[PDB]
Symmetry: C4
Subunit: 189 residues, 4 copies
Amino acid sequence: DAFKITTNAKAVPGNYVVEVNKLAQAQTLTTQAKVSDQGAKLGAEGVTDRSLTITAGNPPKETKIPLSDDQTSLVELRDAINGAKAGVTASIMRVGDNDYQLAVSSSTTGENNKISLQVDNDDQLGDILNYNATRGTAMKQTVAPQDAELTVNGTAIKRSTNSISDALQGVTIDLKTKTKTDEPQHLVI
Amino acid sequence: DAFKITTNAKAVPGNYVVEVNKLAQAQTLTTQAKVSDQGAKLGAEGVTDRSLTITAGNPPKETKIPLSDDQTSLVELRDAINGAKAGVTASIMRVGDNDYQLAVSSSTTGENNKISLQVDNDDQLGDILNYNATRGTAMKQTVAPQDAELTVNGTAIKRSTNSISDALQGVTIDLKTKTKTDEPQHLVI
Amino acid sequence: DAFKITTNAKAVPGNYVVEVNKLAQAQTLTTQAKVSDQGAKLGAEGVTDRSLTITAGNPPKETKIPLSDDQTSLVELRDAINGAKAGVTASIMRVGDNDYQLAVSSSTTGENNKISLQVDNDDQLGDILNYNATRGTAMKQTVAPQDAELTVNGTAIKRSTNSISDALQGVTIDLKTKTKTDEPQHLVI
Amino acid sequence: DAFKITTNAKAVPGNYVVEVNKLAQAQTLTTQAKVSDQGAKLGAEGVTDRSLTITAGNPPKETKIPLSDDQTSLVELRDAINGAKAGVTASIMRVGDNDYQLAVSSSTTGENNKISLQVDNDDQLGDILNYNATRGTAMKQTVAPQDAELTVNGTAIKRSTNSISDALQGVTIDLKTKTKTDEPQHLVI
Ligand SMILES: [Zn+2]
Ligand SMILES: [Zn+2]
Ligand SMILES: [Zn+2]
Ligand SMILES: [Zn+2]
Ligand SMILES: [Zn+2]
Ligand SMILES: [Zn+2]
Ligand SMILES: [Zn+2]
Ligand SMILES: [Zn+2]
Ligand SMILES: [Zn+2]
Ligand SMILES: [Zn+2]
Ligand SMILES: [Zn+2]
Ligand SMILES: [Zn+2]
């Protein structure tokens, strides 16, 4: 109900009480600049040495991709980011008529799986995309990274994914949701 | 569990967290005058120029329908309103023995999909049916109109229906219910 | 989820919001005298004119049944009460080793479906079974009678059973459970 | 939903309201000493008269098993305890890389089904395993023993297992979870 449990030969049969207290999440960043046509080119005109650098993962990998002027519309930025296989995925939310936002989400959950973004050679587009440790309508975190916290027979376990299989001998716990406050889920193997 | 998610070719696979905070509702009005026989004629005797005007929808359309004396019982009013295809639907609730109420509900959900009712040439029936801006025993709002509010990866979306398909690229979300307070539903495409 | 909805030809299709606030319950009475053998005869020896009178139902019916001395053990009282088709049903709860209680429950739910019990010609057994308006280890109410309260499109409906079919035109609502505080169940016919 | 109900011929048909307030649990003890290789031998070198005594059950049985030096690693302790058929089951939790804990859990639920552990002839291993009445880094209770508390038609029942079949005549209740605070589960046989 709050998780699924698959079992191997190495599992020791007994009574278990499980608390799921947090689920692993993936950081998400989202643009805040008002964009009213997703096809509209947001970047400066004529730049030939523009690039976007994404830092993502654990351990972190940096990916630098070039961007032509044609590629600075939300639709083409998304397509570019997704093409990069850079450890994040990008998608466009249509808040309403003539109101669009680009969302960049880590591909991997975890408290320590944060994203950064840095545009080089285009301050205008940077003021829409750039994201790092400090902030001032700039790119904004809208989902916080976090690990899964769950307790197995009173013992607290923290992991970066929701598929916990490196904890209990011969058991995988695929986390689906939290368990109620004063109510661990009593299970029996 | 709090919604169903259908997917198209254009969807971008990733981790999503969803909050559903409100569901779209349809305004409902309900009579408050004590009526003890649903077949009993509630209107004045002998009027030949009686009508009911319903305003409903977005954008709003006005519908004027005539009502003969025979048509001013709850049962026939309901049948008249429903026959009108006027953007509202009408039904009789039997609170108990000898205690009936007529309910008129917008056909379309939304914060801005409000109903008005105006009887012309029958002050008595009007004192049962009329509903507008200014209002003991007159027609009364009993369900408030509202939009759906939900958040997709931390980004707030407001819509007038519970079938949200104009938000995320290649995703429909058919909302079924709210999600718990401190607990967005973690999904994976 | 909080109820099931069956539909007839007379139903008017539209948007409905439902609150279930209370479910109909059946009064239950339960003995409090310590009884350690369910076969043990609890009544006085030698009485030949003993009887139990049950009042139950709506409208109420009185049923007077005789009881031989052999019939004053919990097991035989239960069997006697159940044989009477007197509008209540009786069952024995085994709280633990050598600790038994007889439970008499109305056969019909409702705020106004209360039980009374009166033994005639056996004060000893009376001090275990008798139940009426005033009380002083005597028979005790342990489930309170109540009607179902639910609201349909903002309109409050009260009924004595959990199968509400005399309210909305061509709809039955079989109530299964309450709905959350600030959260009516949005349905669509 | 909060329990399953199997029925026999002896059941008396009627209306029942059930509260489940607690589920029976099994005591669990867990090591607190930092262990970074589950294969590493935790006991003293050269001892030939080492043993572990487990007290478990209701009524309690004592089991004394010998332990060779090779057997004092978490992996082998677990295998030894499980081999003993001593009324407890043992399993290793991997809190993280180089961080292991041994968990010993009663095989039987109940408030009165507590475990003790006593090592003889190995003060060092004892400082990891020993558990009794008087207790930083010693064996620790992490799940408390408890009975099932549930109420059936307002009458409180306490039992040491979650399969309650010695309470109501011809009914078993296999408890799955608690029921909400102000909301007993209304059932009908
Ligand atoms: Zn971590
Ligand atoms: Zn700038
Ligand atoms: Zn709602
Ligand atoms: Zn008037
Ligand atoms: Zn709106
Ligand atoms: Zn969560
Ligand atoms: Zn009533
Ligand atoms: Zn007396
Ligand atoms: Zn519990
Ligand atoms: Zn020591
Ligand atoms: Zn006990
Ligand atoms: Zn209830």
